[PDB]
Design a protein around this ligand. Sequence first.
Ligand SMILES: Nc1nc2c(ncn2[C@@H]2O[C@H](COP(=O)(O)OP(=O)(O)OP(=O)(O)O)[C@@H](O)[C@H]2O)c(=O)[nH]1
Ligand SMILES: Nc1nc2c(ncn2[C@@H]2O[C@H](COP(=O)(O)OP(=O)(O)OP(=O)(O)O)[C@@H](O)[C@H]2O)c(=O)[nH]1
Ligand SMILES: Nc1nc2c(ncn2[C@@H]2O[C@H](COP(=O)(O)OP(=O)(O)O)[C@@H](O)[C@H]2O)c(=O)[nH]1
Ligand SMILES: Nc1nc2c(ncn2[C@@H]2O[C@H](COP(=O)(O)OP(=O)(O)O)[C@@H](O)[C@H]2O)c(=O)[nH]1
Lengths: 428, 428, 433, 433, 116
Amino acid sequence: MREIVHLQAGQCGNQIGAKFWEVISDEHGIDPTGTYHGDSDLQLERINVYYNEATGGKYVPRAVLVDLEPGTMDSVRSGPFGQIFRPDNFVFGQSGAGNNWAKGHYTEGAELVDSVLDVVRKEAESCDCLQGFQLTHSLGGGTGSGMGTLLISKIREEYPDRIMNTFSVVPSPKVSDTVVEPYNATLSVHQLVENTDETYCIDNEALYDICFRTLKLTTPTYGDLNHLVSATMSGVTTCLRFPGQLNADLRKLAVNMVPFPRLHFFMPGFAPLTSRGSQQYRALTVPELTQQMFDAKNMMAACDPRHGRYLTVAAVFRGRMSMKEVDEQMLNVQNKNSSYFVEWIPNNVKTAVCDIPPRGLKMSATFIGNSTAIQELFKRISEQFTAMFRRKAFLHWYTGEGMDEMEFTEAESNMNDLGNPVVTRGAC
Amino acid sequence: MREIVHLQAGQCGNQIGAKFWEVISDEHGIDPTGTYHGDSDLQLERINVYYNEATGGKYVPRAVLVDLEPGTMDSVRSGPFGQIFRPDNFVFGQSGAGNNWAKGHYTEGAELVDSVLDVVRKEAESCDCLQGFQLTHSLGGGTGSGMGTLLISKIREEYPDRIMNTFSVVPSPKVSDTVVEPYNATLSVHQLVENTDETYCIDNEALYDICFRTLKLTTPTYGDLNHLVSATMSGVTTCLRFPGQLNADLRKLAVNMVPFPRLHFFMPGFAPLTSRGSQQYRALTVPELTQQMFDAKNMMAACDPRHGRYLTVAAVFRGRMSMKEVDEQMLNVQNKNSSYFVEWIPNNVKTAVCDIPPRGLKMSATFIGNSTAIQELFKRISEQFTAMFRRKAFLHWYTGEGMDEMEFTEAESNMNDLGNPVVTRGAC
Amino acid sequence: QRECISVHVGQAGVQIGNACWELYCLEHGIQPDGQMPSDDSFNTFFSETGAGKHVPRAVFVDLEPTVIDEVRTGTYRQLFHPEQLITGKEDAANNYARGHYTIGKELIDLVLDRIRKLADQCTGLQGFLIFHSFGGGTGSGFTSLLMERLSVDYGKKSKLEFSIYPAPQVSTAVVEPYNSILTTHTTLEHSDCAFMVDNEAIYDICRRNLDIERPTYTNLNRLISQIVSSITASLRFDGALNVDLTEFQTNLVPYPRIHFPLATYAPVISAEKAYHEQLSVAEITNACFEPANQMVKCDPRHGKYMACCLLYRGDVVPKDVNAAIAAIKTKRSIQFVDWCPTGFKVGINYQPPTVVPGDLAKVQRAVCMLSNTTAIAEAWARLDHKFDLMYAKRAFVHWYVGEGMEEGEFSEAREDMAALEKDYEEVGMDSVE
Amino acid sequence: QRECISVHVGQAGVQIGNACWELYCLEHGIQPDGQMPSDDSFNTFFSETGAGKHVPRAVFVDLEPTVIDEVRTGTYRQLFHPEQLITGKEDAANNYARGHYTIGKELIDLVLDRIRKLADQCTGLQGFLIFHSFGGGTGSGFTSLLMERLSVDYGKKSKLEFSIYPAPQVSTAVVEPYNSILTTHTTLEHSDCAFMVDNEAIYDICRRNLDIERPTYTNLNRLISQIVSSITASLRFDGALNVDLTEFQTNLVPYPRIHFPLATYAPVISAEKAYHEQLSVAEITNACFEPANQMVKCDPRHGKYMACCLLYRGDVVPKDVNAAIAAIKTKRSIQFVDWCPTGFKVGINYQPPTVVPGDLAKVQRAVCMLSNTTAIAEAWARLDHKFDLMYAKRAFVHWYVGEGMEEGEFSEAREDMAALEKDYEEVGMDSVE
Amino acid sequence: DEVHQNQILRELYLKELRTQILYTQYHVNPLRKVHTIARKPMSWHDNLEEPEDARFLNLIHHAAQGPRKKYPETQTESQEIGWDSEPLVNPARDDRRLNHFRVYNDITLYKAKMWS
Ligand SMILES: Nc1nc2c(ncn2[C@@H]2O[C@H](COP(=O)(O)OP(=O)(O)OP(=O)(O)O)[C@@H](O)[C@H]2O)c(=O)[nH]1
Ligand SMILES: Nc1nc2c(ncn2[C@@H]2O[C@H](COP(=O)(O)OP(=O)(O)OP(=O)(O)O)[C@@H](O)[C@H]2O)c(=O)[nH]1
Ligand SMILES: Nc1nc2c(ncn2[C@@H]2O[C@H](COP(=O)(O)OP(=O)(O)O)[C@@H](O)[C@H]2O)c(=O)[nH]1
Ligand SMILES: Nc1nc2c(ncn2[C@@H]2O[C@H](COP(=O)(O)OP(=O)(O)O)[C@@H](O)[C@H]2O)c(=O)[nH]1
């Protein structure tokens, strides 16, 4: 048996994991109170992967809920699926992170990381086999960036051979909600690069483009914009939750998707996504699924692959179908679009087919990409950082909390070092 | 069949003895009035270990409740289980306590304690084979120390083949309700060391810490604070009242559990302690019991176990339950906690399993521990005693009762002389 | 008496093995469970426990669960001994170094113990049918690790492999070429005969001859099950020519190195298509030597046949087959090597193949064609080319070197591949002395 | 007619008797009350008393109550003689001094009188089956005092310990390598044979074969009961080869000093596994010699067998026995001593092993392989390594000194067991003269 | 400050004590992970015959019940193989007119017991 322990930091990642839990409890057929009202026994075959068993069939998420401000945990407790977690796993903090990475790494957050290590440890040993840890945080802004960068730093020294899934919302093109998001982002990527094995960058304006241009929704909110992300980490860990055909777990993916140890920044996507009005005119088959998943309007990151080259492509299909179409159109996209795929890594598409599909469909496809188009996203925050850092602004508190300019300089130098590799891969 | 004669010295000793009789009369099925109303006949097959059988089918406790102030006996007889005790053993006394050791060990404590001996020898002799005594008392304050130490010294000489379980409330570092308490503690340790065979020190701070950090109570009262202790008491003496496999008595625990004639100071633990909120969230099994058993929150003497090697560890389980989860998981505890166990004593963990658990539970486990971390009680009384006596204040009372200055100095010398072997066993 | 042990490593191993045992149960008469409903023939595959239960000589092994949990949940959970089915607790994650070096020791001793128990229970251990793939880590690395142990223990026994060759145009993984080159580097010296079954030619033959548009892997695998059932059929049945397992081995290889035959099946037709031609022995022979039905996607016209074993099953007149071989030898489109004129080896088995409820047709004759050809040299050369191309600047190498494998083993595999490709043309060139 | 007296000493001995007598009553026809519904059979273990009852030839004795009062309370109460069950007053508390020297004297008189009274109605007495542990005070000191008194009083009679060996890795007691080291100093000269069983071997056997992930001491004692059931079976029923306790005592023990053999049970299969093996005599014999079903955690490959007896009970064809023995004698993994070529015993009995409602299955063939090996040198060194460190600075010794025992006998306990290790290394060497 | 730490914990306990919802007495047991103890053979602790669970009795029989007479569909692509495992129209295959199975004659009866 295999399992993943769910680390849930910040406020962003707090609600990310919150909406993740209703999605996979509805997939497994779980009542809000923790009762199994199921229909198929394949939900209970492999349920010891996110839901630890208790007496009476009391299933509990194996998640830990960390936030330096104690209001978002009150919100998720008061939420619909809130009376389901371990209350000891609700790690609280009586201070203010205040959207500061300095206060998320070198302060009361580092006073709380010992308790967070205690509870994540106690979640770890009460099993036998650890595939790894899946954390949700915000790459821009405080808390979750600071919590993520300190917490993965401790966990990698603790358990050094397991999988890290860092689900991060990168800072944003059109808008941004914290003035120091470039400051948090650059030196958050600085810890993220030598620590984590699999990193999902999700762009907010990409999510808004999906809910408006493709979904044609009238008033989406953080609920359904959060749910779209919830589906695309529910998809990746599915061959390990349901009986699968050419099944693929997270390491099976990571080994064949990252070519080099540092280019582990990905491009998620879930795409049987249809506008409401056009759902009735849809013709759901594997070819139109393939067209929509390789069409870059349902991409979870606002990084156009037409502006670069794909390195590796993964497709975690789910459902009841034949599969010459699966492989002949993974051939056909390679044949039709040839310049966008690197020639030093040909036949570069992993495919998996879980057989149990999500509720509401009977095929889904979690599309995962590793391309050179992550580089526009990395650069734009690098120049935003240099523009904010040349005049030495928004920085006095960051120095006063216990940092120096040398660390900021090394962070900018490390993303300038990330300016090298996947650029050289762009031109071979 | 065996017996236990159960002594209560002081206000604290009377109260925790009353809670003892409450919990084991719940376990043995006897009402307030003495009449048996039980469900299983295994509950009276060895009823005559703590209960003298009396005519009329009602059974009375075999105990004496001795205090030098005539109010706590009235409080106990006005308590819920008030009409259960023999009024011949309600040893009162009209004098002034003055939370003193000299006024209980060189003064009218002497005139009361021979009446105590007179009234305790009756049920200490009306027996087939008694195994020993349980004195419940407290070092801090008077009566329970002053009467207690002299009573121990008399009864150990007069019955020299009996196990002496003295459960003693040792001071807290954050509070004490007695200023002359370092004098009482160091003058009680001197009497306790070459006398008792099994003294169990419980520290009120670590008793409070379970009520919040583990039990998650709201308004902790001294009833619950004593109730945890009485649960440990029933856990320590359970093989002789209820049958099972690997039955452990006081002698078998002692010969296993005290290595040297001086090293008999003990630290207990009771650890199926669940919060009212988190009880449904538990998955109650034996490996989950053992982590809470060896965790540094359910140990009731305020000592971090990481400050010293365990000399010996005993585990007495209750409930019908297979022993792979005992034996293998005891090995897992000893294997990962390798430096916290001594190298000169291999396989230093005992085992007992009784078939019937405490009522309202399904599995129980009482922890018994002898380590080198007794320093964090004894040196942590010693610095107060030496700064408490170098000034030679709070002392004219004691030397006016019949005390003199010198035997204070030998009392301190012996009490810090105890530290030296339980230093040397830490570093072999 | 005459029996062979079927061991299936990898998810592909488990699924083709499920197809194999599903076909064998209905071929013999065995129910979904071990029981026999109300003579010797079971002995080749199935042992006989009392009161009619029959236990397969099957060792289903995977480093990862859920593919055996598949079996232990489905309708063949009573058929197998539950301890013959061997599971790990950690997937090989598409890595030869994990399949051979890090996660191999938690399972290799138990697998060899189970193989030893079956070999003791077996009277005449003719050989092993291993079922794996040249693709993923579970199918590659653990089969590789199995080979040296099983050859050290039972070096006098026979070895037939059934491997899924990496596809010519599609593939599924990015490290299928790495795992393929490594597993053939290690299994080249120890494998005895290894029937390559490339994946895409299955799709092409199922699209053309079967006329079916929704086959999944079960439908693609039942063809391979029919191939292996035809292969080890005369070991079990009465016939005219009794072909034996050592007889396949001594015929399909020219050299101690060239042990990669290409098979195909005749009558691959689909019931509402067989009402409209002969299925007569001449066409039965010719459809095998048509470059449209071979099970490995390489065209034999840019190659030379070395030796061909034909296994006919059913109402096969023993002299019309000689007529068909005489007809096909004179054709200029089919060309042989100049050092082997006698090339067609006849095996005749008397009873027709048994039809599974599905797509294949119940046909009164069927030959499986077993050719050793030089057309596989281009597939081996392209796998070599792909390995050079993706090994040019150490792509996907850090995982393998961190998982216990040493860097120079890649170069050793490359050099032995260059040696194998050289040996192909050195034996394919015409003699002039 | 052919009877031996069973003594059960200490809690471990009482509980393994608790399993063995309920197994024996289902072997024969005795109900819980003691009455058999309705030839000779029962006489060896069950004495007929006029009314229809079959009272045991047993003395359950323990210094402590609370374990034999449950025999005096439970379902099988009407079966035991109400004075065969003996209890003292208090626990001997893991102390050899409280087992032997001071509280042993009020119980040794009564228990030896009860042995005399049971042996009064005994015509042909082969000997004594004494069931105890190397752990607690009752199991060690009282056993030592009993065998000293039995050597004084019945000095020519055979004695077989079925000892509970201390767990080498894990343990349940802390002063076991004191109590064991003394009881094996004292019962060494007085015990004719000591069949030796630890706990963790049954733990692993039930984990890997019976598929029970938390078995308990009831499950341990049931398999120990099956071992003693198979060992005392030829003096119960009729078979091809009849072998008894005197013959076991003569031939499993090569030297006066080396009388410590080990068991191994055959099939321990678990109901939903016995439909999938043949349960042939050959594989049943091999499963005994595999170093994973061994009854004690010592490695037989780390040693050499001296003599073994194989007790085939059930439908055993009388020459599969030596077909299997000829198979074993040729393997180069089971190394024997060069000074004992003929070292095997065959004992064949027609009575199939019975089964109580529990974990084992209805098996029609079984063998309790009993071997005397040199691999117990590792176990004795491993137990002595616990003793040297603890005696190095006088740990735990104050109870022993103050409870009547003299301090200095630990010294010749160490000297005597060093002599036992020297005897093992002198008997294990290959002959060169 | 303990006086404030106890206050914030007290606020927390008031939170779950006013909003905690009990598990509403269903005891949904998984059908694939159950492992038990064995009772002592003569004892008054045990052999008192507690009654069973008839739902568990027919529910284990429902779990060990086959995928076909289980799920009335073909739930996975793995339940496609072996689903229609009954044979086709009657083989009638004991007729050796067109059936060529081996048969063990006395030479092979003697031969199967060789060597081993
Ligand atoms: N007939 C058939 N072929 C399969 C099936 N599954 C996979 N294959 C083929 O096998 C190739 C890789 O499968 P494997 O080598 O078995 O993968 P694996 O051994 O499980 O290795 P991992 O990725 O590490 O788990 C794919 O490219 C497929 O062409 C199947 O279910 N049936
Ligand atoms: N089969 C079986 N073995 C047991 C049982 N109880 C104890 N043992 C074995 O005995 C060892 C310790 O128990 P004993 O040596 O019998 O203890 P004792 O003889 O009763 O001596 P005291 O503890 O002083 O009462 C354990 O390590 C077990 O290996 C039992 O109930 N059944
Ligand atoms: N997908 C999703 N994103 C959210 C949700 N709530 C907030 N976000 C994003 O989280 C970002 C802010 O996170 P941040 O301030 O860094 O969290 P903090 O550091 O803990 O304060 C905003 O830009 C939102 O777009 C949600 O419920 N679902
Ligand atoms: N556990 C527990 N401790 C108590 C109880 N009553 C008093 N104590 C402890 O007893 C200590 C002082 O008691 P003490 O001075 O000896 O009372 P005295 O015997 O009348 O002199 C205090 O620190 C209390 O913590 C009780 O009911 N339960």
